[PDB]
Amino acid sequence: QKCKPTSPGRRFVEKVVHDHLHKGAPYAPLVEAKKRTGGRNNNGHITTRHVGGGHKQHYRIVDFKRNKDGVPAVVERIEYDPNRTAHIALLKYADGERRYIIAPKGLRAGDKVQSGNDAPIRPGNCLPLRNMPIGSTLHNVELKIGKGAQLARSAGASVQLLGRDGSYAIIRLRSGEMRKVHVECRAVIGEVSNQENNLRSLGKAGAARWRGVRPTVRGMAMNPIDHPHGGGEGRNKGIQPVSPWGQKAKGYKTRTNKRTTKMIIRDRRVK
RNA sequence: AUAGCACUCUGCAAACACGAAAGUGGACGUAUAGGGUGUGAUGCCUGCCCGGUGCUGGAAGGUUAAUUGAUGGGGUUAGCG
């Protein structure tokens, strides 16, 4: 869906339209306040540039652990979440408890989900990797027993279960990495919803300002005191590209962790 | 500056930033995400060069630090003259 060019700022706007989303307010008992930061830490200094402004948002409490084992639940509705790119699903359990989960692709109001060792193989069901079938497509992959889902949670994301060896399952991630995960950790059947999210076109600078991104100033445009790229009469680069703090930006690798190297079977390649 | 484009880094106790540390931002986010760099709607497009500098990946040959202390050369004196 592309907007008509009735004004110059509308010529290149492309939105994604899902008519099945809930139109009303979110579920109040599962919503809490959240303040803006401006990219500043407790010293008051800017630690992440280009952050500030944007629309006011509430936080939605999403159940990532899925520890309500054995109790079936029905989907009430699919909701828009301002905190993430994925849609969320409101669940009503057989005992009347309500929770939010990351909505898998295809899930609608009326579908049935559950979690545990003996949960049936359906999208949105949460099971241990030791019980997942080989070759299946999963999302919301847990890394520490009991911590909850951490991997493959963004819109349209999924991982592939390749095999099980010892106490570890082998998974392929969207980045191309092949990784080991302890078989006691849980995952969710299916892929994340809103997979058309990357087809949107903002169309104007105000659309990014609404999302809270402040403008980026190139190092080429500064003075020598501000940036290694600054200075010169006219336009000239004359230097291998670096960050404002002097770290090379073209191909130089920055990973330093040595504690978790054993879990990486095969790197995505040019890391 | 900008929407759009591209390269590259980052598997989460993420990279990156602040700080002496504790800790904090990134983010109560998880590669359709986050940082850095360049270009600047859109249309048609974007040729040749890896010798130099850099980056990435190999090789185990040559060179090299602390550490180690085999040998050789002196000082001194019991004794012998």
How many helices (H) and strands (E) chain A has is answered by 1, 15
The phi and psi torsions of A9 (rounded to 5 degrees) equal -80, -5
d(CA A174, C1' B27) / Å: 20
**Distance between CA atoms of A220 and A108, rounded to whole angstroms?**
50
| Sequence-distant contacts of A118-126: CB under 8 A, at least 24 apart | A118/A70, A121/A189, A122/A189, A123/A189, A123/A190, A124/A75, A124/A89, A124/A188, A124/A189, A124/A190, A125/A188, A125/A189, A126/A66, A126/A186, A126/A187, A126/A188
Three-state DSSP at A178 gives strand
- Rounded CA gap, A40 and A46, in Å? 4
Which bases of chain B are under 7 A from a protein CB atom?
Answer: 1-4, 7-19, 23-26, 28-42, 53-57
Task: Kindly state the tokens that stand for A265.
Answer: 């079977």
- The reply to whether A190 has its C-beta less than 7 Å from any atom of strand B is no
User: Which pair of structure tokens corresponds to residue A48?
Assistant: 């992440």
Is residue A89 classed as helix, strand or coil in its secondary structure? strand
Query: In terms of DSSP bridges, do strands A159-165 and A178-182 run parallel, antiparallel, or are they unpaired?
Result: unpaired
For residues A185 and A146, give the distance between their C-alpha atoms in angstroms, rounded to a whole number: 8
Nucleotide with C1' nearest the A267 CA: B11
Please name which of A174, A161, A199 lies closest in space to residue A15, comparing C-alpha atoms. Answer: A199
A223 CB inside 7 Å of strand B: no
- C-beta of residue A186 within 8 angstroms of C-beta of residue A114: no
Which method, experimentally, gave rise to this model?
cryo-EM
Backbone angles phi, psi at A216, to 5 degrees: -100, 125
Cα–Cα distance between A247 and A13 in angstroms, integer?
36
SS3 A125: coil
Rounded, the Å distance between the CA of A216 and C1' of B59 is 43
CB atoms within 10 A of CB A170: 18
A101 is near strand B: CB distance < 7 Å: no
CA A209 to chain CA centroid, nearest Å:
20
Q: Let me know: does A114 contact A125? Beta carbons within 8 Å.
A: yes
CB-CB contact of A124 with A113 (8 Å): yes
Distance CA A189, CA A1 (A): 30
Tokens describing residue A160: 């592939």
